[PDB]
Nucleic acid binder design. Structure first.
Ligand SMILES: [Mg+2]
Length: 670
DNA sequence: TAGGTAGT
């Protein structure tokens, strides 16, 4: 009991009763996402919505609406009620431009060379014991310090080249807008923007003059793609992707971002005290501690054996063998090539010894296992990092028919691994600089796991059988494909990576049917769990009841959201809890402060029976056990959904869909 | 080339 439970602070703060609406008002369009007024849309022939206040004149902008009914907040469903409290706070109390001025005062900016780093507030609203809590969090944005108008050297013809690039409006660093149009100067429109900074953002006239300087009224007026309002380059700043930054700058900026969960909690509590709408103390929540379940490998004599971590999996010098080897690859000698960077060709003698030792040790396992061996006699080849197509130009000219492997030794890519696969060649690249500095073979061991997962080998499985016959990871996103499912068995072992062809938007009922009809996987009289990032439409509900009755299967679905607003004020890991019907899942440890996973909308369809399930200790354990099924060298999100995400991203990167290998669970796309 | 770290 003592070792099983821990109480920790979460980023939830009770909203004061003065700011909670007692009545909601229903309306419908008598004459798009009208989120501006803080509503909740329920579509029909004429769209219908709810507001956290009454619109006395049934019109505002000109859209003419019609009154339906009035209901008390306590009577409406918590999910909607929470969204209406946020809307009331956003639209009536204007929390958004207030949270902006609070953060600037707490989290000041950070300047490194030409770039500046700001912070912005994220917020959600959650219902607990009849009260409402504000989930308050903060993130960061990096922009060009020097504003757009001065950046283009006050030249309109130059500014026109920036059309289609991402910018931020200085007082609002959260929203990254896209420039679309650049037109003639309007001093009236500049005074409109200037008044907005004083009226909405509440900035003093001195603050306008301090940050923007002497306002140029002869400035061009520009328009963005995402909103119909005018923009002026003196008030805007260029934004970019974090990865696009020069390594030298990224390392320097790090210090400002990198904060421990406890240290970050201190800033949220600092921000919470200033916000007049909520209470100053964060919410105390009871968390379960997940049991660190063992894994199952094979003994020297091929018997199942328990191992708690994969860090000892390939520490030969006690000896573990693979649990499963696919029908194709079993006891084969693979035609293997070793592609080396021409820059590091002056160190090949040492590079030969590194790979030869690794495979020489791999062979000690490979001889009494029925594992595939590796053949690289005179197959040592050279390539260039900026060379591009030259390496594959010579590779295409080869006669490879059978599945083959390639180890890529460079000097510091996704492009080469994609082009190499087109000749049925599985590849795992290596950066020599890191492999040369391998302390006690840590990388060498992590390599063997990756190359095996790539070769459909199931080395280790779970020491526990789940009640589900199938755990399916689903993701929906150039090949007439719109998504895929990754199917795992009862022991957490990969079975299939199955792409889904669109008939058109891809939904769950169609996916279940495609799997039965076109994918040849038995989904009748079984216990299926679907893990997805998205949410099921109310219209899909009656259709899901139908399919589950017909198949006679227990079909479940749970939403697993990596990007959420929660944060736990602990350095601890392997913990889980529920707040406002949401699973706060924190499986992993991070040397630079972790972020929880949100778990919601757990539905069940048992032979024509829709039922809503509350987030258990059971599934949270199950979902944790799945984060341990890491074949690529644990995971934040469960393995089924993680590998589905990876496959969908590969499709966008124009990767070959080799069905034969996908059918046997070869993770070549990783 | 490992993992995680739409109001101007
Ligand atoms: Mg890899």
């Amino acid at each position: 009991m003592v070792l099983n439970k821990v109480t920790y602070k979460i980023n939830a703060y009770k909203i004061k009763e003065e700011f909670i609406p007692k009545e909601v008002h229903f309306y419908r369009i008598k004459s798009r996402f009208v989120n501006f007024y803080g509503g909740m849309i329920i579509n029909k022939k004429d769209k219908s919505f709810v507001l956290p206040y009454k619109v006395d004149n049934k019109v505002l902008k000109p859209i003419d609406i019609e009154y339906i009914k009035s209901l008390k907040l306590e009577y409406v469903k918590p999910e909607i009620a929470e969204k209406l409290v946020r809307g009331y706070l956003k639209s009536v109390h204007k929390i958004e431009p207030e949270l902006s001025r609070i953060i600037k005062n707490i989290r000041k900016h950070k300047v490194v060379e030409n770039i500046k780093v700001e912070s912005y507030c994220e917020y959600e609203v959650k219902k607990h014991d009849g009260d409402y809590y504000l989930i308050l969090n903060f993130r960061h944005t990096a922009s060009i310090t020097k504003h757009l108008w001065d950046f283009v050297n006050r030249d309109k013809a130059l500014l026109e080249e920036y059309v289609g690039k991402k910018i931020i409006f200085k007082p609002n660093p959260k929203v990254r807008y896209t420039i679309s149009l650049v037109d003639a100067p309007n001093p009236q429109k500049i005074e409109e923007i200037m008044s907005h900074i004083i009226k909405y953002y509440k900035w003093s006239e001195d603050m306008v003059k301090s940050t923007f300087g002497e306002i140029d009224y002869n400035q061009p007026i520009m328009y963005c793609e995402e909103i119909l309002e005018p923009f002026a380059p003196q008030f805007c700043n260029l934004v970019f992707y974090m990865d696009e930054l020069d390594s030298y700058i990224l390392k320097e900026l790090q210090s400002y971002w990198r904060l421990s969960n406890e240290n970050k909690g201190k800033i949220i509590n600092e921000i919470a005290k200033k916000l007049r709408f909520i209470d100053n103390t964060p919410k105390e929540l009871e968390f379960m501690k997940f049991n660190n379940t063992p894994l199952l490998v094979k003994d020297v004599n091929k018997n199942p054996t328990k191992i708690y971590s994969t860090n000892t999996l390939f520490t030969w010098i006690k000896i573990y063998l693979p649990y499963d080897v696919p029908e194709i690859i079993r006891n084969k000698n693979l035609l293997t090539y070793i592609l080396i960077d021409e820059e590091i060709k002056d160190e090949l003698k040492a590079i030969k010894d590194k790979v030869n030792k690794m495979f020489r040790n791999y062979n000690k396992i490979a001889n009494k296992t029925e594992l595939p061996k590796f053949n690289y006699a005179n197959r040592w080849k050279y390539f260039s990092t900026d060379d591009i197509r030259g390496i594959i130009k010579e590779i295409k000219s080869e006669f490879n028919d059978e599945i083959c492997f390639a180890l890529i030794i460079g000097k510091e890519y996704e492009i080469l691994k994609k082009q190499l696969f087109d000749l049925k060649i599985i590849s795992q690249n290596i950066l020599w600089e890191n492999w040369r500095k391998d302390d006690k073979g840590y990388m060498t061991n992590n390599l063997l796991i990756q190359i095996m997962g790539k070769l459909g080998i199931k080395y280790f499985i779970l020491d526990s059988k789940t009640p589900y016959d199938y755990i399916m990871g689903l993701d929906t996103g150039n090949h007439r494909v719109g998504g895929c499912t990754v199917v795992y068995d009862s022991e957490g072992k990969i079975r299939r990576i199955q792409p889904i062809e669109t008939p058109e938007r891809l939904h769950l009922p169609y996916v279940i049917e495609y799997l039965e009809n076109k994918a040849n996987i038995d989904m009748e009289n079984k216990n299926i769990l679907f893990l997805r990032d998205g949410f099921i439409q109310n219209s899909e509900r009656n259709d899901l009841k139908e399919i589950s009755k017909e198949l006679n299967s227990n079909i479940e679905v749970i939403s697993i959201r990596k990007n959420n607003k929660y944060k736990v004020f602990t350095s601890d890991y392997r913990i889980g809890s529920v707040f406002g019907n949401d699973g706060i899942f924190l499986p992993h440890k991070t040397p630079f402060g972790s972020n929880p996973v949100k778990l919601s909308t757990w539905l069940r369809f048992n032979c024509g029976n829709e039922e809503g399930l509350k987030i258990n200790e059971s599934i949270m354990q199950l979902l944790y056990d799945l984060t341990k099924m890491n074949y690529s060298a644990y995971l934040r999100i469960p393995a089924p959904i993680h590998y589905a995400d990876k496959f969908v991203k590969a499709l966008g990167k124009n990767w070959k869909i080799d069905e034969e290998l996908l059918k046997h669970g070869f993770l070549y796309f990783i």
